[PDB]
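Attaching the record inline, Q. Sequence:
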Amino acid sequence: AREYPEEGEFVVATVKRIHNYGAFLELDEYPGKEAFMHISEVASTWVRNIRDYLKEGQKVVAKVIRVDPRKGHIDLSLRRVTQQQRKAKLQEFKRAQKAENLLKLAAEKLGKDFETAWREVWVPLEEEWGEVYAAFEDAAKDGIDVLKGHVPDEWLPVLKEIIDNYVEVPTVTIDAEFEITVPKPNGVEIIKEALIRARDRANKEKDVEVKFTYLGAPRYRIDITAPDYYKAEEVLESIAEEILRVIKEAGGEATLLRKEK
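Structure, as predicted:
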Protein backbone atom coordinates (compact mmCIF):
# COMPACT_ATOMS: atom_id res chain seq x y z
CA ALA A 1 0.00 0.00 0.00
CA ARG A 2 1.70 3.17 1.23
CA GLU A 3 5.48 3.54 1.32
CA TYR A 4 6.46 3.01 4.98
CA PRO A 5 5.22 0.63 7.69
CA GLU A 6 2.43 1.64 10.03
CA GLU A 7 2.97 3.04 13.49
CA GLY A 8 2.98 -0.22 15.41
CA GLU A 9 3.24 -2.96 12.75
CA PHE A 10 5.21 -6.08 13.47
CA VAL A 11 7.63 -6.29 10.58
CA VAL A 12 10.29 -8.51 9.08
CA ALA A 13 13.79 -7.21 8.43
CA THR A 14 17.20 -8.47 7.35
CA VAL A 15 20.10 -7.40 9.56
CA LYS A 16 21.97 -5.14 7.14
CA ARG A 17 24.59 -3.50 9.42
CA ILE A 18 25.15 -3.61 13.15
CA HIS A 19 27.42 -1.90 15.66
CA ASN A 20 28.02 -0.60 19.19
CA TYR A 21 24.75 1.34 19.39
CA GLY A 22 22.38 -0.51 17.14
CA ALA A 23 21.48 -2.23 13.94
CA PHE A 24 20.30 -1.01 10.59
CA LEU A 25 17.98 -3.48 9.01
CA GLU A 26 16.19 -3.47 5.69
CA LEU A 27 12.48 -4.24 5.74
CA ASP A 28 12.02 -7.35 3.63
CA GLU A 29 8.49 -6.23 2.89
CA TYR A 30 9.15 -2.62 1.87
CA PRO A 31 11.50 -2.70 -1.17
CA GLY A 32 14.56 -0.63 -0.34
CA LYS A 33 13.40 1.27 2.81
CA GLU A 34 15.85 0.69 5.65
CA ALA A 35 15.12 0.91 9.35
CA PHE A 36 17.12 1.29 12.56
CA MET A 37 17.04 -0.66 15.81
CA HIS A 38 18.76 0.85 18.85
CA ILE A 39 20.73 -1.43 21.14
CA SER A 40 18.31 -0.46 23.86
CA GLU A 41 15.75 -2.51 21.95
CA VAL A 42 17.60 -5.69 21.18
CA ALA A 43 16.79 -7.27 24.58
CA SER A 44 14.85 -6.56 27.81
CA THR A 45 18.20 -6.11 29.55
CA TRP A 46 21.15 -3.97 28.48
CA VAL A 47 23.25 -6.07 26.10
CA ARG A 48 26.94 -6.97 26.51
CA ASN A 49 27.63 -7.76 22.81
CA ILE A 50 24.87 -7.09 20.26
CA ARG A 51 26.62 -9.94 18.45
CA ASP A 52 25.01 -12.51 20.76
CA TYR A 53 21.70 -11.42 19.22
CA LEU A 54 22.05 -10.06 15.71
CA LYS A 55 24.15 -11.26 12.76
CA GLU A 56 24.61 -9.88 9.22
CA GLY A 57 21.83 -11.07 6.92
CA GLN A 58 19.79 -12.47 9.81
CA LYS A 59 16.02 -12.05 9.36
CA VAL A 60 13.85 -10.84 12.22
CA VAL A 61 10.39 -9.68 13.17
CA ALA A 62 10.34 -6.40 15.07
CA LYS A 63 7.87 -3.79 16.20
CA VAL A 64 7.84 -0.42 14.50
CA ILE A 65 8.22 1.62 17.68
CA ARG A 66 8.34 5.03 15.97
CA VAL A 67 8.48 6.16 12.35
CA ASP A 68 8.85 9.30 10.16
CA PRO A 69 8.17 8.91 6.38
CA ARG A 70 9.02 12.48 5.41
CA LYS A 71 12.61 11.49 6.26
CA GLY A 72 12.51 7.75 5.64
CA HIS A 73 13.57 6.74 9.11
CA ILE A 74 12.07 3.67 10.72
CA ASP A 75 12.91 2.91 14.33
CA LEU A 76 12.53 -0.76 15.31
CA SER A 77 12.17 -2.96 18.38
CA LEU A 78 12.99 -6.47 19.34
CA ARG A 79 11.98 -6.31 23.01
CA ARG A 80 8.23 -5.85 22.70
CA VAL A 81 7.65 -9.09 20.77
CA THR A 82 6.20 -12.07 22.64
CA GLN A 83 6.44 -15.55 21.06
CA GLN A 84 2.82 -15.18 19.90
CA GLN A 85 3.40 -11.68 18.52
CA ARG A 86 6.24 -13.12 16.46
CA LYS A 87 4.95 -16.31 14.87
CA ALA A 88 1.73 -14.36 14.34
CA LYS A 89 3.70 -12.49 11.69
CA LEU A 90 6.28 -15.11 10.77
CA GLN A 91 3.12 -16.89 9.72
CA GLU A 92 1.47 -14.29 7.45
CA PHE A 93 4.90 -13.77 5.93
CA LYS A 94 5.48 -17.49 5.21
CA ARG A 95 1.89 -17.24 3.98
CA ALA A 96 2.11 -14.40 1.48
CA GLN A 97 5.55 -15.85 0.81
CA LYS A 98 3.91 -18.82 -0.96
CA ALA A 99 1.20 -16.57 -2.45
CA GLU A 100 4.17 -15.00 -4.22
CA ASN A 101 6.00 -18.11 -5.56
CA LEU A 102 2.60 -18.91 -7.07
CA LEU A 103 2.14 -15.55 -8.83
CA LYS A 104 5.76 -15.64 -9.96
CA LEU A 105 5.13 -19.18 -11.15
CA ALA A 106 2.33 -17.55 -13.15
CA ALA A 107 4.53 -15.21 -15.18
CA GLU A 108 6.66 -18.17 -16.25
CA LYS A 109 3.81 -20.11 -17.85
CA LEU A 110 1.98 -17.00 -19.10
CA GLY A 111 5.37 -15.67 -20.17
CA LYS A 112 5.17 -12.15 -18.77
CA ASP A 113 7.10 -9.70 -16.56
CA PHE A 114 7.08 -9.88 -12.74
CA GLU A 115 6.01 -6.24 -12.37
CA THR A 116 3.58 -6.27 -15.32
CA ALA A 117 1.69 -8.95 -13.37
CA TRP A 118 2.29 -8.00 -9.76
CA ARG A 119 0.42 -4.82 -10.71
CA GLU A 120 -2.53 -6.53 -12.40
CA VAL A 121 -3.22 -9.16 -9.72
CA TRP A 122 -1.11 -9.16 -6.56
CA VAL A 123 -2.57 -5.70 -6.15
CA PRO A 124 -6.17 -6.20 -7.25
CA LEU A 125 -6.23 -9.19 -4.89
CA GLU A 126 -4.28 -7.96 -1.82
CA GLU A 127 -6.88 -5.14 -2.07
CA GLU A 128 -10.20 -6.85 -2.77
CA TRP A 129 -9.45 -9.65 -0.29
CA GLY A 130 -6.91 -8.53 2.30
CA GLU A 131 -4.61 -11.42 1.50
CA VAL A 132 -3.52 -12.89 -1.82
CA TYR A 133 -3.01 -16.42 -0.61
CA ALA A 134 -6.48 -16.49 0.93
CA ALA A 135 -7.87 -15.41 -2.45
CA PHE A 136 -5.82 -18.16 -4.12
CA GLU A 137 -7.08 -20.59 -1.51
CA ASP A 138 -10.66 -19.58 -1.84
CA ALA A 139 -10.16 -19.83 -5.57
CA ALA A 140 -9.07 -23.41 -4.99
CA LYS A 141 -12.20 -24.11 -3.01
CA ASP A 142 -15.14 -22.23 -4.59
CA GLY A 143 -13.59 -22.30 -8.09
CA ILE A 144 -11.20 -20.14 -10.10
CA ASP A 145 -14.14 -17.99 -11.27
CA VAL A 146 -14.07 -16.04 -8.00
CA LEU A 147 -11.39 -14.02 -9.76
CA LYS A 148 -13.18 -13.24 -12.99
CA GLY A 149 -13.83 -9.53 -13.52
CA HIS A 150 -11.42 -8.87 -10.67
CA VAL A 151 -8.35 -9.75 -12.74
CA PRO A 152 -7.69 -10.14 -16.49
CA ASP A 153 -9.61 -12.98 -18.13
CA GLU A 154 -6.28 -14.02 -19.74
CA TRP A 155 -4.87 -15.04 -16.35
CA LEU A 156 -7.28 -17.49 -14.78
CA PRO A 157 -6.40 -20.55 -16.99
CA VAL A 158 -2.79 -20.52 -15.84
CA LEU A 159 -3.78 -19.85 -12.25
CA LYS A 160 -6.33 -22.69 -11.93
CA GLU A 161 -3.50 -24.90 -13.19
CA ILE A 162 -0.97 -23.63 -10.64
CA ILE A 163 -3.37 -23.30 -7.72
CA ASP A 164 -4.68 -26.85 -7.99
CA ASN A 165 -1.19 -28.35 -8.24
CA TYR A 166 0.61 -26.61 -5.34
CA VAL A 167 -2.26 -25.51 -3.10
CA GLU A 168 -4.51 -28.17 -1.58
CA VAL A 169 -7.73 -30.01 -2.47
CA PRO A 170 -10.71 -28.84 -0.37
CA THR A 171 -13.43 -31.36 0.49
CA VAL A 172 -17.18 -31.58 1.18
CA THR A 173 -18.94 -33.39 3.99
CA ILE A 174 -22.32 -34.71 4.98
CA ASP A 175 -24.10 -35.97 8.05
CA ALA A 176 -26.80 -38.60 8.15
CA GLU A 177 -28.13 -40.86 10.86
CA PHE A 178 -29.46 -44.38 11.20
CA GLU A 179 -31.92 -46.12 13.46
CA ILE A 180 -30.11 -49.42 13.89
CA THR A 181 -31.55 -52.07 16.20
CA VAL A 182 -30.53 -55.63 16.84
CA PRO A 183 -32.54 -57.68 19.42
CA LYS A 184 -29.97 -60.11 20.80
CA PRO A 185 -27.75 -60.29 23.94
CA ASN A 186 -24.90 -58.98 21.78
CA GLY A 187 -26.75 -56.70 19.35
CA VAL A 188 -24.43 -53.85 20.15
CA GLU A 189 -21.45 -56.07 19.51
CA ILE A 190 -22.51 -56.58 15.90
CA ILE A 191 -23.99 -53.13 15.37
CA LYS A 192 -20.53 -51.86 16.23
CA GLU A 193 -18.86 -54.64 14.35
CA ALA A 194 -21.33 -53.81 11.54
CA LEU A 195 -20.43 -50.11 11.29
CA ILE A 196 -16.77 -50.78 11.81
CA ARG A 197 -16.87 -53.34 9.02
CA ALA A 198 -18.57 -50.86 6.66
CA ARG A 199 -16.44 -47.99 7.84
CA ASP A 200 -12.88 -49.25 7.31
CA ARG A 201 -14.23 -50.53 4.01
CA ALA A 202 -15.21 -47.15 2.60
CA ASN A 203 -12.41 -45.23 4.27
CA LYS A 204 -10.08 -46.96 1.84
CA GLU A 205 -11.12 -45.10 -1.32
CA LYS A 206 -8.55 -42.38 -0.69
CA ASP A 207 -10.10 -38.94 -0.50
CA VAL A 208 -12.93 -40.30 1.59
CA GLU A 209 -13.50 -40.51 5.32
CA VAL A 210 -16.41 -42.07 7.18
CA LYS A 211 -17.20 -41.65 10.89
CA PHE A 212 -19.87 -43.28 13.01
CA THR A 213 -20.79 -41.33 16.08
CA TYR A 214 -23.27 -43.11 18.35
CA LEU A 215 -25.85 -40.77 19.83
CA GLY A 216 -28.36 -42.71 21.90
CA ALA A 217 -30.07 -45.99 21.03
CA PRO A 218 -31.11 -46.71 18.36
CA ARG A 219 -29.50 -43.79 16.48
CA TYR A 220 -25.99 -43.59 15.06
CA ARG A 221 -24.83 -40.79 12.80
CA ILE A 222 -22.41 -41.12 9.94
CA ASP A 223 -20.10 -38.29 8.82
CA ILE A 224 -19.01 -38.83 5.22
CA THR A 225 -16.21 -36.72 3.82
CA ALA A 226 -15.51 -37.05 0.11
CA PRO A 227 -14.13 -34.50 -2.31
CA ASP A 228 -17.58 -33.51 -3.54
CA TYR A 229 -21.20 -34.04 -2.86
CA TYR A 230 -21.53 -36.36 -5.84
CA LYS A 231 -19.07 -38.74 -4.21
CA ALA A 232 -20.43 -38.23 -0.72
CA GLU A 233 -24.04 -38.96 -1.63
CA GLU A 234 -22.85 -42.10 -3.35
CA VAL A 235 -20.65 -43.19 -0.46
CA LEU A 236 -23.62 -42.96 1.84
CA GLU A 237 -25.84 -45.07 -0.37
CA SER A 238 -22.95 -47.52 -0.39
CA ILE A 239 -22.96 -47.60 3.44
CA ALA A 240 -26.73 -47.91 3.07
CA GLU A 241 -26.98 -51.42 1.68
CA GLU A 242 -23.78 -52.47 3.44
CA ILE A 243 -25.42 -51.77 6.78
CA LEU A 244 -29.12 -52.61 6.21
CA ARG A 245 -28.09 -55.86 4.55
CA VAL A 246 -25.54 -57.05 7.11
CA ILE A 247 -27.60 -56.29 10.20
CA LYS A 248 -30.56 -57.94 8.50
CA GLU A 249 -28.55 -61.19 7.98
CA ALA A 250 -27.99 -61.08 11.73
CA GLY A 251 -31.73 -60.51 12.24
CA GLY A 252 -31.77 -56.77 12.65
CA GLU A 253 -33.43 -53.72 11.13
CA ALA A 254 -31.25 -50.78 10.15
CA THR A 255 -32.71 -47.81 8.31
CA LEU A 256 -31.56 -44.41 7.11
CA LEU A 257 -33.66 -41.28 7.66
CA ARG A 258 -34.38 -38.75 4.87
CA LYS A 259 -36.94 -40.43 2.55
CA GLU A 260 -39.98 -38.14 3.17
CA LYS A 261 -41.01 -39.33 -0.33
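Strands lie at 10-19, 22-27, 34-38, 59-68, 73-77, 174-181, 212-214, 219-224, 253-255. The chain is about 35% helix and 20% strand.

More tomorrow.
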